[PDB]
């Protein structure tokens, strides 16, 4: 297999930079419409949960992590602008897979297979959260796709800290030690919301630093050879270390029925 290289080296003039790096306070101000129902805590748990759906499906459909990364940001970007009541996050979940797998030329995931991918991941990996069958059909995804497309102003090309990560390791020369761990830390950062606040090169250098701590690699000299904002890099590490203390304490399977029932419910038509 292989991954989409299109627009590599042009983050700095991207739809990504210039419209989808969002100030943190703006993000938390829109969230206050949803924090009437869910707590600040229950809400970040909710992200982690759906992030894992966008991974399960993405695995079940044999997609590459670069598709998924993108699928997960599409999802995040929607609900960083609109309330949970607007469109079901269950419905949005694979509508983001579908679109991302097309946007990068991986494939038109068929109708029948997108929906059974849907039914199966929920039937097997998530019968603690969603008891009864996945209720939607392809017309619901197709409609949901048009809303999803509309919100993003068709800003469809996205980035992830993977590609800059690979560039950074290939200096140190620890592809037989570092890269595997770092790559999962970048995976785990998707449980949080750093990819809407931070340019990926920094999310890569953050994960690479945490990796260097875990395996006791001396990388001090190397990190001081970067004309980069190290405070902003230190901000991201805190978030990454906090992510793991949150993982430790969050019992997803015992807590997610109750958190989902507390989500604000859609208003029906007249």
């Amino acid at each position: 297999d292989d991954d989409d290289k299109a627009m590599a080296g042009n983050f700095w003039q991207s739809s990504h930079y210039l419209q989808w790096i969002l100030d943190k306070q703006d993000l938390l101000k829109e969230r206050q419409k949803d924090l009437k129902f869910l707590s600040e805590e229950e809400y970040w748990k909710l992200q982690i949960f759906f992030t894992n759906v966008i991974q399960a499906l993405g695995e079940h459909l044999k997609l590459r992590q670069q598709v998924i990364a993108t699928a997960t940001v599409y999802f995040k970007r929607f609900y960083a602008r609109y309330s949970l009541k607007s469109i079901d996050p269950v419905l949005m979940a694979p509508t983001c897979v579908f679109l991302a797998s097309k946007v990068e030329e991986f494939g038109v995931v068929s109708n029948t297979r997108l929906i059974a991918a849907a039914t199966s991941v929920l039937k097997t990996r998530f019968s603690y959260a969603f008891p009864k069958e996945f209720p939607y059909r392809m017309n619901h995804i197709l409609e949901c796709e048009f809303y999803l497309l509309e919100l993003m102003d068709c800003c469809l090309i996205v980035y992830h800290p993977y590609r800059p990560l690979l560039q950074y390791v290939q200096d140190m020369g620890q592809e037989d030690m570092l890269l595997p761990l770092a790559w999962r830390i970048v995976n785990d950062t998707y449980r949080t919301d750093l990819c809407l606040l931070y340019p990926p090169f920094m999310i890569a250098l953050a994960c690479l630093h945490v990796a260097c701590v875990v395996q006791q690699k001396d990388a001090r000299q190397w990190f001081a050879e970067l004309s980069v904002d190290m405070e902003k890099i230190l901000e991201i590490i805190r978030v990454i270390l906090k992510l793991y203390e949150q993982w430790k304490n969050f019992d997803e399977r015992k807590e997610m029925a109750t958190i989902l029932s507390k989500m604000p419910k859609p208003k029906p038509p007249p």
Binding site: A6, M7, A8, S15, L91, K102, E105, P135, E150, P269
Partner: protein, 336 residues
């Protein structure tokens, strides 16, 4: 459905509709498998400028349509066509793309001269801007995949007078014509490369210089009559000239159907002499470096831009037309 009502109606009230914003009905200028293109104008008296309205074929949004929008939303270069806006029609599930309007293109410019020749300063300047745009695309790892005269637009009277604008890049899956296709694709190659676009540029450049499509062919994976024509202009490749031709899926079909001796007095030098282009000239030598059989012996976008042909008098210009009146007619509308 299970969506929020207040979310739907708010969005439905505020959503801009292409039929409300633009006057295009009766102004269809283009038809094809992709759908339709109109020369549209805005209904308000804000500006009297023209726009290209592409209505895409089919309901929903195809992978090709997704890919065109994704790339157009990021690409920004003077010689690549700009997406202004995208309209999403929730009623009928149709998608429209708004571009700046290009009055002319190479297909229509060439057809005018073949019905008549292109000034040489104009050719050079076209070639340079085509190379400038393709170099930009290749630097960003985006291949065109289907570069033809109908894609290379030229802006007419306006603020961007005589500027090349390339369209339809980065989403073509693998009567239709193969006259601008590279021989590796004709011999079965299963993927797009930067070399493929350079062959296309080589074919276009030849046709700018002569008005004839260099590999013009009869209309019908492996395409016999097309290759026959290629070898009649170029000659049949020596083993040394293209060593990995053996690795092509259709190499054994090539040996069955063809014989080297048939194209024994054929070569690009002899072709271009018949059309009064001197093989001592810098133009020919650049053309020969683009039109090379073996893709790995084909020069790059940037190398082509560094060629001494572009340092020879006259230099190319921002305005392809170079001041003087455009004799080319404007686009006529359609009906059916």
């Amino acid at each position: 459905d299970k969506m929020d009502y207040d979310f739907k109606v708010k969005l439905s009230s505020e959503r801009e509709r292409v039929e409300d914003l633009f006057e295009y009905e009766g102004c269809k200028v283009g038809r094809g498998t992709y759908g339709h293109v109109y020369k549209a104008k805005r209904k308000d008296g804000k500006d009297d400028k023209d726009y290209a309205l592409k209505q895409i074929e089919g309901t929903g949004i195809s992978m090709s349509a997704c890919r065109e929008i994704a790339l157009l939303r990021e690409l920004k270069h003077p010689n690549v066509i700009s997406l202004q806006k995208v309209f999403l029609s929730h009623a009928d599930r149709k998608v429209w793309l708004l571009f700046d309007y290009a009055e002319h293109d190479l297909w229509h410019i060439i057809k005018f001269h073949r019905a008549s020749q292109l000034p040489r300063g104009m050719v050079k300047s076209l070639l340079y801007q085509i190379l400038d745009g393709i170099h930009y695309l290749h630097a960003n790892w985006v291949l065109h995949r289907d570069l033809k005269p109908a894609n290379i637009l030229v802006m007419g009277e306006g603020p961007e007078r005589g500027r090349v604008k390339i369209a339809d890049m980065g989403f073509a899956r693998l009567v239709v014509t193969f006259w601008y296709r590279a021989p590796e694709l004709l011999l079965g190659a299963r993927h797009y490369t930067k070399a493929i676009d350079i062959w296309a540029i080589g074919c276009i450049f030849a046709e700018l210089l002569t008005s004839e499509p260099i590999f013009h062919c009869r209309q019908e994976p492996y395409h016999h009559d097309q290759l026959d024509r290629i070898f009649n202009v170029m000659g049949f490749p020596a083993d040394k000239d293209w060593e990995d031709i053996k690795k092509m899926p259709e190499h054994s079909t090539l040996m069955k159907d063809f014989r080297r001796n048939t194209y024994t007095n054929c070569s690009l030098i002899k072709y271009m002499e018949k059309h009064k282009v001197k093989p001592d000239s810098k133009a020919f030598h650049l053309l020969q470096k683009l039109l090379t059989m073996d893709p790995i012996k084909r020069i790059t976008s940037e190398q082509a831009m560094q060629d001494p042909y572009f340092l020879e008098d006259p230099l190319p210009t921002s305005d392809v037309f170079a001041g003087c009146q455009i004799p080319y007619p404007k686009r006529e509308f359609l009906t059916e």
